[PDB]
């Protein structure tokens, strides 16, 4: 199946939650540029004809692989609705 989906499911209080998180994080991956990751140094996802999956394959793939590590935080009401999209564009070319 998928890389430690069980581990993932364990990280959420409800199944469907994981999806929502998974998704929105895949969005922020492309929108604010594709360099907005947290685990690019070693073991960043990869592809087979030319090791280029380092630039742009699947988004969700990343999200999950990122969520698998204790880097990202997810919550009901973590950051002020609008202040988040403002600060993101600022710190990301």
């Amino acid at each position: 199946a998928e890389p430690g989906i069980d581990k993932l499911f364990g990280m959420v209080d409800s199944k469907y939650r994981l999806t929502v998180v998974v998704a929105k994080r895949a969005q922020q991956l492309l929108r604010h540029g594709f360099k907005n990751t947290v685990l690019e140094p070693e073991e960043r996802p990869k592809m087979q004809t030319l090791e280029g999956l380092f630039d742009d394959p699947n988004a969700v793939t990343w999200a999950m692989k990122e969520l698998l590590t204790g880097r990202l935080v997810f919550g009901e009401n973590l950051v002020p609705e609008d202040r988040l999209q403002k600060e993101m564009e600022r710190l990301y070319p």
């Binding site: 499911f9 209080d13 409800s14 199944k15 469907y16 939650r17 999806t19 929502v20 998180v21 929105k24 994080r25 922020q28 907005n36 947290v38 880097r71 990202l72 935080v73 997810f74 919550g75 009901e76 009401n77 973590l78 950051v79 002020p80 202040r83 988040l84 600060e87 993101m88 710190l91």
Partner: protein, 275 residues
């Protein structure tokens, strides 16, 4: 689908309907008909007279008519068992309310009256399984329950407070009225109601949201009456909310998670820097 506990935000309603429907294809009273008869509060072919009174039994035999008498010290519920019926309770022992005095199927309504609701429910559920079981099918009771429960989500009114008698309204909507009639605002104007057993079809028929009603029943009347009283359709349920094209109240649409946010420790300290 998994094995751990059900995740909040799952279209159980659906799931139940499906699991119970698929099987329907191989059930040819004996068979599907019975399942219909069962989901639809009805008077089956072979009716079996239930005992409205809970006492003991005594029988009088040999004559064009046989009579089974549930008797106690004060009264006996005379039961006329035609010369062509088959009874299996006999001259002597006790019989609870709503107990098969005749042989065969039972009638929900009567059974609701005598024994009560917690029995009708349990009766349906089981009398349902009874068929699929005999047909190889193995479906969890859960689902038979989910459905059946909706078959008694409505209740009539005998004691009025805000609305008039002769009403047929949502069981829970009444627990809100009576809860806030005794609790918050004083004056105990009890809202005595009578649990109401409705077939699956008529439960749908008389549903509460107007959007939903607009689909099947007459579209004229539904909008007419919803017009008069500025009805506010609180969007809950998949049908109604579909029409809007909005996100389903269930699934990923679950109010529980439709709102969740993601952060990278770098942006969390960055929001703290905006302070």
């Amino acid at each position: 689908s998994m094995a751990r506990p059900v995740s909040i935000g799952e279209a159980v309603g659906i799931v139940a309907a499906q699991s119970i429907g698929e099987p329907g294809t191989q059930l040819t009273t004996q068979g599907l008909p019975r399942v219909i008869e069962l989901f639809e509060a009805r008077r089956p072919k072979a009716k079996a007279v239930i005992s409205e009174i809970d006492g003991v039994v005594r029988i009088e035999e040999t004559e064009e008519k046989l009579s089974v008498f549930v008797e106690s010290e004060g009264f006996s519920k005379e039961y006329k068992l035609p010369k062509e019926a088959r009874l299996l309770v006999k001259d002597g022992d006790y019989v609870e309310a709503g107990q098969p005095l005749t042989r065969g199927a039972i009638d929900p309504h009567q059974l609701l009256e005598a024994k009560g609701p917690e029995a009708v429910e349990r009766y349906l559920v089981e009398e349902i399984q009874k068929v699929y079981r005999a047909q190889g099918v193995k479906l969890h009771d859960k689902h038979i329950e989910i459905v059946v429960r909706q078959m008694m989500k409505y209740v009539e009114v005998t004691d009025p407070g805000d609305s008039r008698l002769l009403e047929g309204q949502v069981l829970e909507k009444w627990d809100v009225e009576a809860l806030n009639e005794r609790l918050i605002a004083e004056g105990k104007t009890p809202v005595a109601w009578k649990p109401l057993l409705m077939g699956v079809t008529k439960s749908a028929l008389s549903t509460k949201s107007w959007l939903s009603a607009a689909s099947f029943q007459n579209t004229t009347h539904v909008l007419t009456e919803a017009a008069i009283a500025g009805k506010k359709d609180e969007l809950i349920g998949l049908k109604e909310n579909v029409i809007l094209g909005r996100l389903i109240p269930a699934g990923t649409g679950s109010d529980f998670v439709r709102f969740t946010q993601v952060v990278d420790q770098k942006t969390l300290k960055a929001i703290e820097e905006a302070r």
